[PDB]
């Protein structure tokens, strides 16, 4: 009479793995272009 | 008619690009570097 009270279980399988983080959206609002200076000033 | 404009002769507003006319600038271009020489 085996039954699983019996038989043991060495590790669970984790199956599947998330991340809690968020959506950024940004790129989608801002006019961002790279600058390659420490100051940066545009004309009007 | 358009004046383009002159600084104030302070370095201050040399250095920021500040003038009295129609134009500012970005900056007082660049002239060069003098490094402290070293002794022998």
Same mark, same amino acid.
């Given at each position: 009479?085996?039954?699983?009270?019996?038989?043991?279980?060495?590790?669970?399988?984790?199956?599947?793995?998330?991340?809690?983080?968020?959506?950024?959206?940004?790129?989608? *609002?801002?006019?961002?272009?790279?600058?390659?200076?420490?100051?940066?000033?545009?004309?009007? | 008619?358009?004046?383009?404009?002159?600084?104030?002769?302070? $370095?201050?507003?040399?250095?920021?690009?500040?003038?009295?006319?129609?134009?500012?600038? *970005?900056?007082?271009?660049?002239?060069?570097?003098?490094?402290? $020489? *070293?002794?022998?």
């Amino acid at each position: 009479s085996t039954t699983t009270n019996s038989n043991s279980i060495g590790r669970p399988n984790l199956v599947a793995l998330t991340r809690a983080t968020t959506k950024l959206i940004y790129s989608d *609002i801002v006019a961002t272009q790279r600058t390659n200076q420490p100051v940066a000033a545009f004309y009007g | 008619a358009e004046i383009g404009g002159d600084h104030g002769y302070n $370095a201050t507003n040399i250095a920021a690009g500040q003038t009295s006319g129609a134009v500012t600038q *970005i900056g007082p271009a660049v002239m060069g570097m003098v490094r402290r $020489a *070293i002794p022998n």
